[PDB]
Design a protein around this nucleic acid. Structure first.
Lengths: 288, 109, 285, 109
DNA sequence: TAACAGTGGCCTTATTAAATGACTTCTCCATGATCTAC
RNA sequence: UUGCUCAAGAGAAGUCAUUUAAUAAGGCCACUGUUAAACGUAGGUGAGUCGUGGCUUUAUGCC
């Protein structure tokens, strides 16, 4: 069968300056654009999260064609010919050798840009080279944003050369390394704090961006009313829905939760337990 | 001719007067044998103009720049016209007008 | 009796970079053009959606002449002579030798973004050091919902039962061609307006409209609603499903409106089941 | 037309009157042959306007500023609607309007 | 009251620029030898 | 009444059937807004409802 693992993960609240834009002048700006209600939100590119996943795969052993040097900040290819059968990164993220086994691969992972849950209003941090001497590289400004981030991903498990490689990918999504950004002054952990995963065998997802804010300048996060209506109306089979994280407390505090169809979903407050149950189901379905 | 064209032209004049005032302030700020800025201040103004998002930020920066310019007769004569023009109109169009004023301010100095 | 299934579907809100146009220089140009109000709207070509439907048919049995290899990224023809009587692909989408050439039982129009496209450019760089001509590039995205209009001539099908898998594919559309690695955009619909009538006159094309520039509320329409009220588009032939139902039922005097007696289901699967029951009854399946 | 800009314009007018009154009060404050600055007063007003951090700040600031503006007639026949306008609308929009009023104030004196 | 308003490096790498077949169909002639009717 | 007088280039015809601009990419790495200060001494206000109820001497005040 064609099994797909869709999911929307919500990060933790904190000061973020992860993905920047063109250098411009002395001020480094975030990647921002209109998201909802005509308000400007800050974005984190999906290529950053893919790079973080690749780095996780490299760090925890495994075989990756691309090896981040981490010392000279260079990328080395162990084999000039991509081999998705052997290397994890080639199997998962695909490749494209255009300079002139197939030279191209579609990859089993599809990500979308991480969107800040909170609109980006101000939040420019003054930065100085200090000392008493002054020069051109003395006064600079860096944009930050105190918000949670939320991104959507989908995995075509059957497309994987080795069906068991999905498990390290889930582990990497859980224990994600730093997502490319100014971690020296804005250390933002990208590990999930709320999860909405769906392990189904059809292409429709309906769980793209299920998290929405309340009191637009607050850290509080709640499931969007559209997602709850989707679950209650009959769509989104609860048996295929895995919800885990700090959103579990808010979900259980809802009125008529026991009578709601959302109660029949796999709801775990502890993320590790939810991941373990989901991986058990995945191993059963994929014959691992 | 045409009211919109006249308002646009005299808004260009307003912005040029504001840049003259700001550049005079920068000239007064620097002292000693250090060379006062001429061109890199224009580059800084450009960078600050493009560092703009949404209607609020750009209008805030434009109003602050106009006030920092100090005295200006073109805004003096036309209060309602320029007040309406700045309050209305898309902010991107006003940024285009401001850049056009920047590119042609220099014959004054 | 001639039977036609016209429908306009609305996709979910998300960031999309589906139909890069020509790659002008350093930038992958999202396909766009003028629409509705004289504003630039991004487009998704109908050939992309037809390819997605073909892939859906291939992935679940459903013998097809064209087989997407998915590994060599090439198409293979099982039979060089197109046979609409045997293959779902030839029967549904037609062909052309350049013979019989078919005509195509499915007619589709280009998907149109519900919102104008402002600039939506995303920067892309390749790691660090040893920078070359490919180190820096830009990609154009769009955070809106897409909306397309399709029409099916059920009687034109060689096998009448093949319309059901097409509806299933439309409601379970696979990846519609685009930058899925970076901008994964599901093309499954969250709002549907289907019309199962027996004459070649449809007034539901591109019914969904909200403008309200940068937003996602996606109200149904005012011209389509007026069309329903005026007397044509009889509600018995109208099928409305999806998140638009919640907004529809919250309208004033909705109970007294003729739009009430249309087949309105909040759950898309329930409306699809009812519509398929009606189709099977009408077509003698 | 479209009385929103009517409210915007008379807000600008009463702001100019209030700043004129405050400058007159400053003129009363100073003494002796020292020249009372005029441009520095505008700079100080702009700096104080930029000193605020939303809602409470700049709302009590601008209300206090208008109160010290003195006997403002246009304020007197426009108490209720200007109070409603101040209570509504984002504070940064009010700051933009105030800065525009400062930039277009002089020809009164 | 002051001094700075970024220091770098890149600005796409491939690939294909159409595949078929049709390229009007009819008619309206001018003029003298001969037939024939008055 | 004009090398003229009279004089329809007229009737009919789908540019059609088919086609993913697709596959891959961290705007990255570094930066204190450092150092010093007596508050000395004199600047004001925008807005309803209608005939005794628990204490207390009517009183007259509390809730």
């Amino acid at each position: 069968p064609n099994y797909y693992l869709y999911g929307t993960v919500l990060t933790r609240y904190g000061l973020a300056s992860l993905n920047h834009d063109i250098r411009r002048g002395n001020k480094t700006i975030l990647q921002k654009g209109y998201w909802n209600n005509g308000k400007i939100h800050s974005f984190v590119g999906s290529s950053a999260i893919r790079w973080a996943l690749r780095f996780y795969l490299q760090k925890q052993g495994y075989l990756v064609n691309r090896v981040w040097d981490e010392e000279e900040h260079i990328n080395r290819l162990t084999s000039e010919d991509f081999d998705p059968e052997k290397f994890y990164d080639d199997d998962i993220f695909g490749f494209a050798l255009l300079e002139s086994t197939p030279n191209q691969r579609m990859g089993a992972l599809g990500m979308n840009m991480a969107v800040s849950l909170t609109p980006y209003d101000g939040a420019v941090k003054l930065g100085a080279k200090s000392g008493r001497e002054k020069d051109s590289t003395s006064l600079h400004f860096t944009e930050y944003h105190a918000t949670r981030y939320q991104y959507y991903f989908g995995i075509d498990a059957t497309h994987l050369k080795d069906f068991s490689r999905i498990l390290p990918m889930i582990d990497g999504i859980m224990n994600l390394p730093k997502v490319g950004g100014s971690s020296n002054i804005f250390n933002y952990p990208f590990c999930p704090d709320s999860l909405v995963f769906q392990w189904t065998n059809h292409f429709a997802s309906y769980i793209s961006y299920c998290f929405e804010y309340c009191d637009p300048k607050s850290k509080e996060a709640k499931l969007s009313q559209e997602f709850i209506d989707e679950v209650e109306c009959g769509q989104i089979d609860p048996s295929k829905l895995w919800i885990g994280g700090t959103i579990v407390k808010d979900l259980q505090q809802l009125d008529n939760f026991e009578s709601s169809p959302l109660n029949k979903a796999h709801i775990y407050r502890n993320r590790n337990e939810m991941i373990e149950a989901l991986k058990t189901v995945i191993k059963r379905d994929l014959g691992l | 001719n045409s009211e919109e064209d006249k308002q646009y032209l005299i808004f260009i004049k307003v912005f040029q007067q504001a840049m003259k005032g700001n550049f005079a302030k920068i000239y007064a700020k620097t002292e000693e044998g250090k060379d006062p800025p001429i061109k890199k201040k224009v580059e800084r103004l450009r960078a600050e103009l493009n560092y703009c998002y949404d209607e609020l930020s750009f209008k805030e920066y434009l109003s602050d720049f106009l006030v920092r310019g100090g005295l200006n007769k073109y805004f003096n004569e036309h209060q309602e016209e320029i007040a309406l023009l700045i309050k209305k109109s898309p902010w991107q169009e006003i940024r285009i007008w401001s850049l056009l004023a920047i590119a042609s301010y220099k014959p004054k100095d």
